[PDB]
């Protein structure tokens, strides 16, 4: 239910580095960018049509560690919901508790912030939630658990959160170790390199 | 074509016939190997394909193919067969499930091991 293999392999695969690893040490130093893995990786692979669609879907999933089965349920909900499906699907992926904690700054990585949620270190509206897939609703207040705050990893993750342009729809609190999920995010804020219309066609085939 | 002609004789939903009639729309069926022998492939190919004649529980008598290298199969062997025809062997529409009942798993299988009933090799 979780990827446990090396991470820079996937990162160099799919290509464009998209929100992986702590984010401090230069990504290029840790590996060899612009070179897919494998002995034969050092070559130009003439990608196809299926190829492009697959890569995009795979890329999106990894950014939020969503498995196919899980991701497909998001697509079904996004199609059911009114509005444009692709942004709705992106909104649902961003609304997951583990992703929100990462953007809120309590985790160095989405995986670590997800582990923070998993390890019963997050309080939502006075209720303990340790489920990474919990859907945060607008105006909710997310507060680190008293015991959790004593974790020095969380503290260091706050420091680093400054470099990531603080998401608008998330009101982060420094010493207060809290956050307010103001509202749903919008396509503009999200990385403009995502072509949601490609995702919609691929799953509608 | 004409609606009046079509009203007189409505469209007839054609029934699609199965490629594995002896299975009677069942995924697998157990049988007893009536005969163990070898046969030759079709035209563009040349080999000594290994096939077995098997009597099923429902009385159907059919020939099934063995997809694994080597087999400890002989008279009165009880095997499990599944669907799937052999492109180059006319009249062969079923495959013997390696690693099930009295059919041993393929020796030295390392890839597609689940397709030949071979337990994971110890590290």
């Amino acid at each position: 239910a979780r990827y446990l293999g090396p991470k820079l392999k996937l990162s160099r695969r799919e290509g464009t580095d998209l929100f992986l690893k702590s984010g401090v040490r230069a990504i290029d130093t840790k590996c060899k960018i612009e070179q897919a893995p494998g002995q034969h990786g050092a070559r130009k692979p003439r990608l196809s049509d299926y190829g492009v669609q697959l890569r995009e879907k795979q890329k999106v999933r990894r950014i939020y560690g969503v498995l196919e089965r899980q991701f497909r349920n998001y697509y079904k909900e996004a199609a059911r919901l009114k509005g444009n499906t692709g942004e709705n699907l992106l909104a649902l992926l961003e609304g997951r508790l583990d992703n929100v904690v990462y953007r809120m700054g309590f985790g160095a990585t989405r995986a670590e912030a997800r582990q923070l949620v998993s390890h019963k270190a997050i309080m939502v509206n006075g209720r303990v939630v340790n489920i990474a897939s919990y859907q945060v609703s607008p105006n909710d207040v997310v507060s680190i658990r008293e015991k959790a705050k004593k974790q020095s990893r969380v503290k260091a993750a706050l420091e680093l959160a400054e470099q990531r342009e603080k998401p608008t729809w998330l009101e982060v609190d420094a010493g207060k170790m809290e956050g307010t999920f103001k509202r749903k995010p919008e396509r503009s804020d999200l990385s403009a390199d995502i072509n949601e219309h490609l995702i919609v066609e691929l799953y509608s085939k | 074509a004409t609606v009046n002609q079509l009203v007189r004789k409505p469209r007839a939903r054609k029934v699609a016939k199965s490629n594995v009639p002896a299975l009677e729309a069942c995924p697998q069926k157990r049988g007893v190997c009536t005969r163990v022998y070898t046969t030759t492939p079709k035209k563009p190919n040349s080999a000594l394909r290994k096939v077995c004649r098997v009597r099923l529980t429902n009385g159907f008598e059919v020939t099934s193919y063995i997809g694994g290298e080597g087999h400890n199969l002989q008279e009165h062997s009880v095997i499990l067969i599944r669907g799937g025809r052999v492109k180059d062997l006319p009249g062969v529409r079923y495959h013997t499930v390696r690693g099930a009942l009295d059919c041993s798993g393929v020796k030295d299988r390392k890839q597609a091991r689940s397709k030949y009933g071979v337990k994971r090799p110890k590290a």
Binding site: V24, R25, A26, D28, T29 | -
Partner: protein, 118 residues
């Protein structure tokens, strides 16, 4: 103990008397700086385009501290050194992505100092 980062920006203060070279990140947090005055050049030597290039050579530090590689270029000030310094960054092994002038140009704002009758 410190952190590393890339994708920086270089601010160039090309004053008539001195050249200020500062490398910083996209959020304005400084990583390193070097000046012509601090490179052994005083008086007239502190303004010549050459000495400005030399100041960049000093700024070539922070490499291990911060693998900037690609960096932006901000240039403000009419003084000499609006060309030299830029070359030195290339020869130092950096990827100059954009080059824009950020010289403060008032739209008839404050009154300037009187003229030097000399």
């Amino acid at each position: 103990v410190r952190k590393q980062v890339s994708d920086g920006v270089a601010h160039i203060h090309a004053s008539f008397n001195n050249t200020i070279v500062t490398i910083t990140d996209r959020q304005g947090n400084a990583l390193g700086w070097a000046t012509a005055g601090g490179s052994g050049f005083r008086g007239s030597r502190k303004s010549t385009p050459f000495a400005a290039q030399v100041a960049a050579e000093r700024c070539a530090d922070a490499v291990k501290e911060y693998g900037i590689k690609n960096l932006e270029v901000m240039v403000k000030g009419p003084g000499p050194g609006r060309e030299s310094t830029i070359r030195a960054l290339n020869a130092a092994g950096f990827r100059i992505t954009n080059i824009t002038d950020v010289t403060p140009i008032p739209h008839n704002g404050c009154r300037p100092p009187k003229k030097r009758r000399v």
